[PDB]
């Protein structure tokens, strides 16, 4: 049998992962209660039917009934890891801006030796389950053909030497398509695996203005659609009174961006706002804002490019640290949660 | 060569405009130097003093 919607109303798990069928208006109860301090940065649905992986702090967790039950698989070397799925029951765990890198083959954890001590992105080739790619914070891509066993540098630096690169986001349909984001250097895009990079425009409303690109996510449903989080540093000039933060959308694969969301009390943005594009609708982006502060809780936002408006739901958790979608019923969203109050 | 008011401006700008929860020391230095450059100019004493303060700890 293939992927199915969860066959439960309550989740057997420690509380780090739940699901919603209504865009976050209601969250499935969990048997366990999430404890401070907890982050769930890693959460992916695998191609293996009804199988997901999550990292709750340094606990690697697995579900094989589409999220109804979560069980501990192993303890990872890092307590802060993100997950990238690969074809054939495989995933890579990695610490963002850290050095830890490991492979998950089913239930087997293999520590890898990263070619970078400051990892800012990982991508997998869906047509070749051994072809994995990694980016370092200087903007160097590294390529591997042996499931991460060994590595070699690939292409040129996204922004040239001396850059501080926040992220490299790989197109899930094509490892050779990547978007990089840097400090004052804005965005870049490659369609050839890092051999040539083109500087993006549109992150600043001023021609040639500097910008930051903190995070980007290529739509799993359209290689031409890229969502991004960044700052217009001209708008955020000293003494301006504006932090210049926006969400952006590209329809040419990362060459040019347009502002789609502004940082306001109605749509609150930070330099680490989670981006979760819909895997089936290139018009739709989910994002979050949450804080422990004053017990505000968490907003789960939904942007729709058809109209350009943002809706939201609210829950009481300190934050949503990761999002994945059920491939058989993508209206079912898996949420990895944070609890951080002292 | 940096007083309390200028220190607050430089590091508040670095945090809010340039840093993330996973930023490491290398990126803090880049952010602090760029923030002081934004506020006071690349040839300023403020930038020189920020650079030297991070230079002191080998970064």
From Swiss-Prot, chain A:
Keywords: Secreted, Signal. Its main location: secreted. This is Dispase autolysis-inducing protein. The keyword Glycosyltransferase does not apply. One of its GO terms (cellular component) is extracellular region. On the 2D-gel the determined pI of this protein is: 7.1, its MW is: 39 kDa. It is found in: Secreted. The gene is daip. CDD domains: Sialidase_non-viral. It comes from the Bacteria.
Curated annotation (Swiss-Prot), chain B:
Induction: Is expressed in the stationary phase. Up-regulated by NprA. Coiled coil: none annotated. Disulfide bonds: none annotated. It comes from the Bacteria. It is found in: Secreted. Extracellular zinc metalloprotease. Belongs to the peptidase M4 family. This is Thermolysin. It comes from Geobacillus stearothermophilus. The gene is nprS.
């Amino acid at each position: 049998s293939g992927w199915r919607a969860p066959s439960c109303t309550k989740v057997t798990g420690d509380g780090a992962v739940t699901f919603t069928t209504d865009d976050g208006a209601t969250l499935a109860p969990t048997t366990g209660t999430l404890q401070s301090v907890s982050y769930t940065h890693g959460l992916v649905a695998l191609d293996t039917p009804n199988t997901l992986l999550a990292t709750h702090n340094d606990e690697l967790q697995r579900s094989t009934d589409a999220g109804c039950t979560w069980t501990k698989v192993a303890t990872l070397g890092s307590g802060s890891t993100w997950l990238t799925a690969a074809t054939g029951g495989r995933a890579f765990a990695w610490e963002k801006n850290g050095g830890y890198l490991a492979r998950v083959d089913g239930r087997t954890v293999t520590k890898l030796s990263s070619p970078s001590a400051d990892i800012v992105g990982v991508g997998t080739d869906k047509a070749r389950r051994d072809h994995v790619r990694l980016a370092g914070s200087d903007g160097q891509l590294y390529d591997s053909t042996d499931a991460g066993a060994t590595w070699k540098p690939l292409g040129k630096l996204a922004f040239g030497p001396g850059a501080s690169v926040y992220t490299v986001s790989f197109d899930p349909a094509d490892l050779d398509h990547a978007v990089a984001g840097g400090m004052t250097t804005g965005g870049a895009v490659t369609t050839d695996g890092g051999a040539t990079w083109t500087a993006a425009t549109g992150l600043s409303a001023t021609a040639g203005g500097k910008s930051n690109l903190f995070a980007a996510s290529v739509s799993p449903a359209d290689r031409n659609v890229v969502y991004a989080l960044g700052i217009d540093l001209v708008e955020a000039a000293p003494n301006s009174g504006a932090e210049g933060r926006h969400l952006y959308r590209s329809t040419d694969g990362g060459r040019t961006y347009t502002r789609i969301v502004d940082d306001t009390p109605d749509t609150e943005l930070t330099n680490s706002t989670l981006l979760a594009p819909s895997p089936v609708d290139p018009n739709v982006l989910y994002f979050e804002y949450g804080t422990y502060f004053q017990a505000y809780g968490t907003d789960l936002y939904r942007y729709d490019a058809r109209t350009g408006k943002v809706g939201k739901t609210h829950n009481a958790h300190d934050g949503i640290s990761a999002i994945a979608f059920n491939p058989a019923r993508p209206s079912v969203m898996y949420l990895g949660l944070e609890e951080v109050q002292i | 060569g940096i007083g309390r008011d200028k220190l607050g401006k430089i590091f508040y700008r670095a945090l809010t405009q340039y840093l993330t929860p996973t930023s490491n020391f290398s990126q803090l230095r880049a952010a602090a130097v760029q923030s002081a450059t934004d506020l006071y100019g690349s040839t300023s004493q403020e930038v020189a003093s920020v650079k030297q303060a991070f230079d002191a700890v080998g970064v």
